[PDB]
Amino acid sequence: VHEIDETLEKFLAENYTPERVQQLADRFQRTGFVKFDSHMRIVPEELITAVRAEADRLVREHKERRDLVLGTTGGTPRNLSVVKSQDVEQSDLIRAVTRSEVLLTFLAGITRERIIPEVSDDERYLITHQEFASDTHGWHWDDYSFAFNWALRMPPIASGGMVQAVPHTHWDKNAPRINETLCERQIDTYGLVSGDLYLLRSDTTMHRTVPLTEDGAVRTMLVVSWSAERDLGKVLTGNDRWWENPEAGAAQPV
Ligand SMILES: N[C@@H](CCCC[NH3+])C(=O)O
Ligand SMILES: O=C(O)CCC(=O)C(=O)O
Ligand SMILES: [Fe+2]
Numbered sequence: 001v002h003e004i005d006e007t008l009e010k011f012l013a014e015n016y017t018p019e020r021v022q023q024l025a026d027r028f029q030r031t032g033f034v035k036f037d038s039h040m041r042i043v044p045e046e047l048i049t050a051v052r053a054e055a056d057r058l059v060r061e062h063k064e065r066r067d068l069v070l071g072t073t074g075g076t077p078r079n080l081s082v083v084k085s086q087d088v089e090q091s092d093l094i095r096a097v098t099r100s101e102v103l104l105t106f107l108a109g110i111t112r113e114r115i116i117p118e119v120s121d122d123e124r125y126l127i128t129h130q131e132f133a134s135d136t137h138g139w140h141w142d143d144y145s146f147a148f149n150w151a152l153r154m155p156p157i158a159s160g161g162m163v164q165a166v167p168h169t170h171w172d173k174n175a176p177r178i179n180e181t182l183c184e185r186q187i188d189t190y191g192l193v194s195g196d197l198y199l200l201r202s203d204t205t206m207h208r209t210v211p212l213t214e215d216g217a218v219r220t221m222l223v224v225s226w227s228a229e230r231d232l233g234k235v236l237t238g239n240d241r242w243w244e245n246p247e248a249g250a251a252q253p254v
Contacts, residue, residue: 004047004093004096004097004100005096005100005101005102007044007047008043008097008100008102008103008106009102011041011043011044012042012102012103012106015040015041016106018109021106021109021110022109024109024110025109025110025111025112028110028111028199028201029112030167031165031167031188032165032167032168032200032201032204032205033163033165033167033188033190033198033199033200033201033205034110034198034199035190035192035196035197035198036196036197036198036199037192037193037195037196038193038195038196042103042197043097043103043197045195047093047097048150048152048195048197050093051093051094051097051150051152051222052150052152052153052195052220054091054093054094055083055094055127055150055152055220055222056152056220058083058087058088058090058091058127059081059083059127059129059220062083062084062087063081063082063083063129064081064082064083064084064246065080065081066078066079066080066081066082066242066243066246067079067253067254068242068246068251068252068253068254069138069251069252069254070138070140070240070242070250070251071240071249071250071251071252072171072173072176072238072240072250073138073139073140073141073171073176073178073240074139074176074177074178074179075178075252076138076139076140076178076208077136077138077254078136078137078138078242078243079130079132079134079135079136079211079254080128080129080130080135080136080137081128081129081130081131082126082127082128082129082243083126083127083129084122084126084243084244085121085122085123085124085125085126085243085244086121086122088124088125088126088127088222089124089125094125094222098117098125098148098224099117104117104226107146107148107199110199111145111146111199111201111228113228113229114228114229115146115226115227115228116226116227116228116229116231116232117226117227118227119143119144119225119226119227119231120143120234120236122241122243122244122245123143123144123225123241123243123244124224124225125222125223125224125225126222126223126225126243127220127221127222127223128219128220128221128223129218129219129220130161130209130212130217130218130219130220131212131215131216131217131218131219132212132215133211133212133213133214133215133217134211134212135211135212135219136208136209136210136211136212137208137209138208139178139206139207139208140206140207140208141169141170141171141202141203141204141205141206141207142200142202142203142225143171143203143231143234143236144202144203144225144226144227144228144231144234145201145202145203145204145226145227145228145230145231146199146200146201146202146225146226146227146228147199147200147202147223147224147225147226148197148199148200148223148224148225148226149197149198149199149200149221149222149223149224150197150221150222150224151192151193151194151195151196151197151198151221152194152195152220152221152222153194153218153219153220154192154193154194154196154219155212155217155218155219156217157191158213159212159213159214159217160209160210160211160212160213160217161192161209161210161212161217161219162189162190162191162192162209162210163189163190163192163198163207163208163209163210164187164188164189164190164207164208164209164210165187165188165189165190165200165205165206165207166181166182166185166186166187166188166205166206166207167188167201167204167205168204168205169181169185169204169205169206170203170204171203173237173238173240178206181206189210202225203231209221238250
């Protein structure tokens with residue numbers, strides 16, 4: 001019920017000072033990435049366990065396999081299973097924590113700008129489920145500024161699945177220049193463990209997941225998308241919504 005908004009207001013208050021937020025806002029501006037791991041929690045471990053169970057049920061009852069390349073992102077592959085945004089919104093818990101006014105106001109101190117939780121209907125939420133060798137979420141950008149991700153299940157680092165990122169880029173759907181960007185920039189790699197969360201500046205940080213090296217290395221990620229003020233009134237272009245529509249124009253199966 002309404003207990004989650006009071007639980008977050010107490011957990012954030014006893015775990016963060018205003019200047020620590022400013023330090024995280026500096027790292028966020030510099031790298032586009034702030035990891036909330038066991039050393040710096042953002043949500044209590046009780047809620048993570050509950051969210052993990054909600055995602056396991058949604059994956060078990062709604063996972064749809066994706067094996068395609070996206071033209072608007074230089075033909076990068078998408079090899080994983082998805083749970084559409086429409087099915088994730090069935091979870092009252094996920095909607096409660098992700099649309100919480102306490103969380104959006106706190107995280108606004110890290111982004112240093114207003115976080116509007118409203119995005120496109122088919123991209124509000126997303127669960128990616130990777131489990132096969134060479135499963136990957138290829139290099140891409142997001143249409144919206146922010147992504148709040150729940151690394152609910154992570155394999156060991158040696159199995160792959162780390163998040164790679166190139167901050168201070170931009171999405172040009174007509175000329176993605178994926179590999180050209182890598183030749184001009186350096187790649188940051190972030191290791192995640194089960195229960196980690198992270199905030200991503202997803203519209204200017206080219207990112208991907210390192211392909212899994214072996215079958216059974218289950219990787220389940222809850223992806224929450226939020227708008228910035230720059231995202232209001234956005235007109236979607238490219239016809240590349242592969243997660244909702246597998247037969248999108250810019251999507252070619254493999
Ligand atoms: N634009 C991303 C999908 C984002 C889905 C979650 N916000 C891609 O091409 O892979
Ligand atoms: O699984 C991840 O950590 C990244 C997913 C992602 O970038 C997306 O869903 O747009
Ligand atoms: Fe993304």
